[PDB]
Structure formats: structure tokens, C-alpha cells
Design a protein around this ligand. Structure first.
Ligand SMILES: [Mg+2]
Ligand SMILES: [Mg+2]
Ligand SMILES: [Mg+2]
Ligand SMILES: [Mg+2]
Ligand SMILES: [Mg+2]
Ligand SMILES: [Mg+2]
Ligand SMILES: [Mg+2]
Ligand SMILES: [Mg+2]
Ligand SMILES: [Mg+2]
Ligand SMILES: [Mg+2]
Ligand SMILES: [Mg+2]
Ligand SMILES: [Mg+2]
Ligand SMILES: [Mg+2]
Ligand SMILES: [Mg+2]
Ligand SMILES: [Zn+2]
Lengths: 141, 184, 142, 140, 36
RNA sequence: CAAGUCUGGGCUAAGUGGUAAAGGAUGUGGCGCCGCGAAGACAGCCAGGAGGUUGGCUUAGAAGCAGCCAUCCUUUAAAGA
RNA sequence: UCGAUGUCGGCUCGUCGCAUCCUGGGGCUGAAGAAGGUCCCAAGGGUUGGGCUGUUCGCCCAUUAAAGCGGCACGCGAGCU
């Protein structure tokens, strides 16, 4: 799918989402990026779907960079079961995304394909996005 | 390039930045003042410029100073800059990442491939009067697989860098072929 | 063909939820326990009432519909393949395609009519020629 | 190219041409005949040599036409200079042929009329774009 | 016709706004749309 | 229903106000920086609107207009492989 | 609510919602006509009789313009069974 090969622990606490992305606010790779505007948990099935959507669009062309990785496990109890009796079983994994995070990047693609591309990738995310270029995002030192 | 600058007394950071003035500080191995340089021209300039071309800083003293920006802290949520560091100069040779153009067409753009210009702004040690520009590199010979890198380039007399030299400056990688799918 | 996959996506299935029948209490009267999975493109309908829940009975009715399908969807790969082979198989006295006799020493191709005289030689792999002729006699009537 | 509302421009074979395989019936669909462009036509094809013959047609609705013969298409005349028959499934940087500098000026004595330029150098840089279409190298 | 995301399809499509509702006029019928 | 249909400057035309999301639209109002404007097209209105060349390959057919690849050059006021 | 709120189904009596099964308008159509499909507006009024099973739900027989899906303590036992 797109899970992590190994993990020290199988289930982990849900947590929370206090705004600000902390890190990942600049481009640093491609030429155009897709920046998250709302906080959320992005499931690997979305990351996947978005990726395929781009390659499908501009088939045989530039390179795509996936800046996030679903390492947080998602728990979910079975159906018709009551509360308690231990934590549920993992149904998949999700990556935590906060406002300002650059989720994707594209390179070696015309500005048209790029825009159109990312516009489609944002239609698969449970949140709102924004597309960017590159310019002040040069924190090299 | 040029640009007006004013003296900051150190009063209401978050306020002087909304009113239009952009906070910042100019320093060196001697003095260091706190100032405010409006977003308007700063933006316009900073985008054309960057941290490569020198800038003037005409204060109420006329004192036009040559400087380069070292640190620009953004605002995360909703792009905007929150601070800027001005490095004063003189004749002292120091570092700075110099732009990189890669004139050419690799052989890795005929059967699938794209240039990943990794470090397209190399840091180099050199004095003021010695501040070039578009330090082009050749790309017309980069085959699909194997690809150039390190500091194996044309360093005009005076370009006494600070790399390794190994730091992969650019590479040619395959495309994104629709042919995929899997599982198991 | 080689794969073995029948993923019946719940796209052509019409599931019904009728009130349970038989014993129980107030809950058997008032809870829509019984379920009926209906295979629309075929006409087959399976039902379940073994348990007291709907989500375990429609899933148990699919562990049955998949089974009865895994025999009536393979029965057609056995009936579309029992008339797809041909007909020449009586093995009886009078249904021969080629005759090999080492007594008087000869090979008789009853399709083309040829009579080769090297039988101990044909029993080594030299078949190109009678296959050349069998691919002319066979695909010459269609 | 001529006038419109009833014309067709094709690039006939060489030696024989009367049936329907090449474009034989397509011109009958838009108005044509069998006794006007087969034998009382191959007077030119018997002279032009072989390969392809870009001769065209012009319908008038009465068996009349402006049978303006043309010079072999730049797609074929190039197979003569290099040698290959097709060109390349996909052009670019690799190709099974070669064509030196003056190799492209060997065809300059073939294609000279209606190209647009009477001279040899103001009309060769046109075929050099055609040397990046089929593929054929430019030995340099 | 009637959907939630109404946009311009072909070059000739025009975005009209009649009776408070967002409509789409065009040469060929299949392109008509009315937001709602 | 006791106490200003008070004063000054704005915004909204939906009864929004007086429930709701992804997402759509030349709805309005105010700010931006870029074009390009007597080499006076911003839209209509007159005429043009080309040749190698139908680029190759693939294809019953692929002639700019199924798709893959390359994607230059020439004639002119201009016109794309 | 356990110092009591009778629980399936049928029968009787209905009434309300529309995300409409007919009937009435209408836009597309891969709408020639007729007959179909999908979608929008619109309940005012209709929505049949049997076989089987306690059945609801279903399958089936013969029709019909259609044999709509839901709410009302999966309406209704101080009305019946
Ligand atoms: Mg950092
Ligand atoms: Mg009063
Ligand atoms: Mg209201
Ligand atoms: Mg009581
Ligand atoms: Mg009582
Ligand atoms: Mg209709
Ligand atoms: Mg009709
Ligand atoms: Mg309605
Ligand atoms: Mg009886
Ligand atoms: Mg009712
Ligand atoms: Mg209930
Ligand atoms: Mg009662
Ligand atoms: Mg009673
Ligand atoms: Mg009583
Ligand atoms: Zn249109």
C-alpha cells in the first residue's frame, strides 16, 4: 500500500492538531507545490489516489515528489461492538498535516500541466489547498 | 540594488509590521542596529534580488551600506516574511550562495527524464569586488542514468568555495511512466 | 486463461432486511435481523437468520453467495470447455486419424490419404510433414 | 493545392495504378472515373521513374481535371540520399541513417520549383527540419 | 444540466446569471447548465 | 416592552440577517502589481487565413484534428508541423 | 418511564412528507415517427385481484396508466383480532 516497513509499537494515541506546520513550509525540491490550508489526517489511500491522478494526467513526463508519509496508525473497533474491552485494530495509516505544509511538488513539467495537475490532486484531499511557485523559499542558508 | 531603510527604536514589533514596515536587523562584527524596511519595496526588491545581489541601505544618515541578507524567517500559515537579517560588508572576503544556471540539454531528455537541480545555489568564500552571477554549468552531456555532481565545475578565478567537493549539485532521473499498479 | 478471481463488488447486489422469523423475544419482533442478499444479474437469492445481527448475517450470506458462485462460475468454465475441445474421442474401432503398422511397415494418414513407409522413423519425431498436411486438410474446409 | 469545393491531392504509386488499394476509390467518392486516370495518365509515371508520384486532381463534374504533376515528397527523396526505406518509428537523437552536410544539397537539383526560394541555401534549411522528422542524422 | 459545480465547457460557452441562479448559455444544447 | 426611529463614516439586496461543508460563478464594493493603448484591436465590422507538407511511424484510413515520437525551417503583413 | 409506557403481523380508520410509481408540463438524447432513457417543476387525485407462508419482506398466476418509497410509539389491542 504505502505503510511503514516496521514500527516499534503497533497502536498509538490519537493526539491533536495545534495549528502551524512547524516544518516543511518551503519548497526545496521541484518548481510548483501544493500547500495544505486546513489541518487533517491524510490517509495513505488519498496520498496514493492523488499521486496516480497526476501521473495519469501528464502521462510519461516530469517527476513527482511526495513530501509526506503516513506513519500514524488509525484504529477502529469492529461493527455492532460495544465500548471498552481494549483498543481497536489498525485499519490503515494516516499522515498528520497542518496548515502551511507543502504536501507535493512537481518538476520538469510545463506550468500548464503543473497547475492543472495539482488542481486535480487537491480535489482528492479532505481539505483546501493552494498552489505555489518558488522564490523566497530558498532557506539554503 | 537600492532601497530606503529607517531606524527602529524597538517599539511594538507585531504592530510596526502590520502598519506596513517590515522588521529586521543589520549587523556585522562591529555594530548592529534594529530597523524597519516597508514590505512594499522590500518584497518587489527581495524577489528580483534574493541573497545573491548586494543591496544599499540609505538610513536618515545617508550612510548607504552594502549588505546581503542572511536569514529571512517566514510566517508559516499564509506566506509572509517576519524578519530579515542584514550582513554588513566592507572589503572582507566572506561566503554566500551564488546562483546557478545549467545551460544545456542533457541526453536524459529524449527517452524520459528530468533534471533535479539539487543545489542550484552553491555557497562560496570570496570578497566584495569579487561577486559574480550566473555561474553556468554544462548539462549537454548528462546521460539518463549516471549524472554529474560535486564541485567539479568552472570556478572563475577567486571562487574559493566551501563544499566537500561531493555535494550532488544536479542529476537526471527517469520520468513518471503511467505503467505501474501492483499489490501483494 | 489462468487467474482465479471473482470480486463481486456490491454493485449488482440487492440486499433486503426482513424481520426475523422463529424464536426470540421482543427483539426478534422489532429488530430487522433477517437479511436477503439478491444477485440481480443472475437471479440467485441467499438468506441468513443463523445469528441475531444484520451485519454478521449479510456477511455470512456473502460467505455463502461467494461459495455457490465459486461452483456455478467454474461450472461454466467446464461447460464452455467440454464443447470447445472438439469431438474426435470415441477411441472405438473406426475412429482413427493415423495408422501405424510395423508388420508390413508403413504409416497411413487417414485424413489426407498418404501412406508413408517409415514407421520406425516416424516414431522418433519426424512429424513436420504430416503436420504440414494436417494443417492443410484441417483448415481447408472452413 | 489549387481551388476548392471538389478537389483531392494524393501521392500515387509508380508502375501500376488503377484499382482501389492506394486511394483508387476515394477520388470516385468525390467524383472521378476509371478510364481517365489509369492508362491515359501513366504517361508521366512511365517517365518520372518509380517510387511515389505526388500528382493531384481537380474535379469539375465532367471528367475534366488539372492533373498538375509534382515533385516526389521530401519524405521519399530523403530515403535516396541516406538509404533507409522508412525512417524511424520515432525520430529524435537515434536513427538508422546518416546524411552529411552536402548530402542535403544533392536533392537541391530535384526540388527547385514551387518550394518558395529559387536558390539552394534558402531552401535547404527547410529540409533540415525534415531531417529531424524521420530522424536521418546530419554528420557533423 | 443542473449540478453543483457549473463551469465553462467549450470555447463558445458563456456564463449568464438569470433569476438569481447561475446559468450557462451555449451553441449546442448539451452544454446548457443551471446551477442549483 | 422601560429607555435614541440619536449623531458621523462605511458595507449588503439576499429576508442574507433569522442554521451547514467540499466546491462552483464577469454579484457587488475597495485595494495590488503586470500587460498593452496614434508599431492607436478592447469587441464587432472588410479581406486574407500559404508552401515543403499528407512530417515520420503506427493504421482499413490517421491528409494539422485516434495515438506515439521530433517539433525545426522557408515565403511574407501574417499563418501553427 | 421497571408502585407497568402491551411487544410482530393482519383488520378498521386514516393523515402527513417528497427524495414521484402513474397521470399533467418541460430540457437534453447516441430523440426520424411511435415507443424508450436521464434530469428538472409539480402530489391535486389514484395506486387492483389471487396462490404460498403467522409473516413484514419476498417469489409466482392474471391484469393495470401505475400496482411508489417513507413518517405518524417501524400510527392505531380503554377499536378488533
Ligand atoms: Mg531548516
Ligand atoms: Mg416605549
Ligand atoms: Mg431565515
Ligand atoms: Mg404510575
Ligand atoms: Mg397505567
Ligand atoms: Mg422527456
Ligand atoms: Mg418521441
Ligand atoms: Mg421535486
Ligand atoms: Mg386452496
Ligand atoms: Mg402510510
Ligand atoms: Mg424504529
Ligand atoms: Mg390505544
Ligand atoms: Mg386487547
Ligand atoms: Mg375494554
Ligand atoms: Zn460550449
Amino acid at each position: 500500500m504505502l505503510m511503514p516497513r516496521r514500527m516499534k509499537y503497533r497502536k498509538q494515541q490519537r493526539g491533536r492538531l495545534k495549528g502551524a506546520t512547524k516544518g516543511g513550509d518551503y519548497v526545496a525540491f521541484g518548481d510548483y507545490g501544493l500547500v495544505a490550508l486546513e489541518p487533517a489526517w491524510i490517509t495513505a489511500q488519498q496520498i496514493e489516489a492523488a499521486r496516480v491522478a497526476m501521473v495519469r494526467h501528464f502521462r510519461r513526463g516530469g517527476k513527482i515528489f511526495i513530501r509526506i508519509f503516513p506513519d500514524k496508525p488509525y484504529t477502529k473497533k469492529p461493527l455492532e461492538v460495544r465500548m471498552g474491552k481494549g483498543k481497536g485494530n489498525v485499519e490503515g495509516y494516516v499522515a498528520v498535516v497542518k496548515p502551511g505544509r507543502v504536501m507535493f511538488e512537481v518538476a520538469g513539467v510545463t506550468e500548464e500541466q503543473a497547475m492543472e495537475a495539482l488542481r486535480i490532486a487537491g480535489h482528492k484531499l479532505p481539505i483546501k489547498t493552494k498552489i505555489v511557485r518558488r522564490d523566497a523559499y530558498d532557506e539554503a542558508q | 540594488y537600492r532601497l530606503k531603510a529607517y531606524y527602529r527604536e524597538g517599539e511594538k514589533p507585531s504592530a510596526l509590521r502590520r502598519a506596513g514596515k517590515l522588521p529586521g536587523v543589520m549587523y556585522n562584527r562591529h555594530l548592529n542596529r534594529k530597523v524597519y524596511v516597508d514590505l512594499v519595496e522590500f518584497d518587489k526588491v527581495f524577489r528580483q534580488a534574493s541573497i545573491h545581489h548586494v543591496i544599499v541601505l540609505e538610513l536618515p544618515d545617508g550612510q548607504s551600506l552594502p549588505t546581503l541578507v542572511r536569514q529571512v524567517n517566514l510566517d508559516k500559515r499564509r506566506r509572509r516574511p517576519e524578519h530579515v537579517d542584514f550582513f554588513v560588508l566592507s572589503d572582507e572576503p566572506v561566503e554566500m550562495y551564488v546562483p546557478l544556471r545549467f545551460v544545456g540539454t542533457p541526453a536524459g531528455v529524449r527517452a524520459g527524464g528530468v533534471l533535479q537541480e539539487i543545489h542550484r545555489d552553491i555557497l562560496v568564500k570570496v570578497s566584495p569586488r569579487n561577486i559574480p552571477e550566473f555561474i553556468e554549468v554544462d548539462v549537454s552531456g548528462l546521460e539518463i542514468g549516471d549524472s554529474l555532481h560535486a564541485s567539479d565545475l568552472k570556478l572563475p578565478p577567486g571562487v574559493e568555495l566551501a563544499v566537500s567537493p561531493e555535494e550532488t549539485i544536479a542529476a537526471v532521473v527517469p520520468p513518471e511512466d503511467v505503467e505501474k499498479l501492483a499489490e501483494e | 486463461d489462468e487467474e482465479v478471481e471473482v470480486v463481486l463488488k456490491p454493485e449488482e447486489l440487492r440486499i433486503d432486511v426482513m424481520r426475523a422469523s422463529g424464536p426470540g423475544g421482543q427483539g426478534v419482533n422489532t429488530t430487522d435481523s433477517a437479511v436477503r442478499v439478491v444477485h440481480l444479474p443472475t437471479g440467485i437469492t441467499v438468506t441468513c437468520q443463523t445469528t441475531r445481527s444484520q451485519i454478521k448475517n449479510k456477511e455470512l450470506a456473502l460467505k455463502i453467495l461467494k461459495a455457490r458462485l465459486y461452483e456455478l462460475e467454474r461450472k461454466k468454465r467446464e461447460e464452455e470447455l467440454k464443447a470447445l475441445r472438439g469431438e474426435v474421442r470415441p477411441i472405438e474401432w473406426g475412429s482413427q486419424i493415423r495408422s501405424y503398422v510395423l508388420d508390413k511397415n508403413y504409416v497411413k494418414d487417414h485424413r489426407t490419404g498418404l501412406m508413408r513407409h517409415d514407421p520406425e522413423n516416424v516414431l522418433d519425431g519426424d512429424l513436420m510433414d504430416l503436420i504440414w498436411a494436417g494443417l492443410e486438410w484441417k483448415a481447408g474446409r472452413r | 493545392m489549387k481551388k476548392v469545393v471538389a478537389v483531392v491531392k494524393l501521392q500515387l504509386p509508380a508502375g501500376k495504378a488503377t484499382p482501389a488499394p492506394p486511394v483508387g476509390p476515394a477520388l470516385g467518392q468525390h467524383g472521378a472515373n476509371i478510364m481517365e486516370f489509369v492508362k491515359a495518365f501513366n504517361a508521366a509515371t512511365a517517365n518520372m521513374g518509380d517510387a511515389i508520384v505526388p500528382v493531384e486532381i481537380t474535379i469539375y463534374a465532367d471528367r475534366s481535371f488539372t492533373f498538375v504533376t509534382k515533385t516526389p515528397p521530401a519524405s521519399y527523396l530523403i530515403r535516396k540520399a541516406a538509404g533507409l526505406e522508412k525512417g524511424a518509428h520515432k525520430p529524435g537523437r537515434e536513427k538508422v541513417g546518416r546524411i552529411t552536410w552536402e548530402q542535403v544539397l544533392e536533392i537541391a537539383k530535384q526540388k527547385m520549383p514551387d518550394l518558395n526560394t529559387t536558390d539552394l541555401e534558402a531552401a535547404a534549411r527547410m529540409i533540415a527540419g525534415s531531417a529531424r522528422s524521420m530522424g536521418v542524422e546530419v554528420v557533423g | 444540466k443542473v449540478r453543483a459545480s457549473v463551469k465553462r465547457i467549450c470555447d463558445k460557452c458563456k456564463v449568464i446569471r438569470r433569476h438569481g441562479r447561475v446559468y450557462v448559455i451555449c451553441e449546442n444544447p448539451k452544454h446548457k447548465q443551471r446551477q442549483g
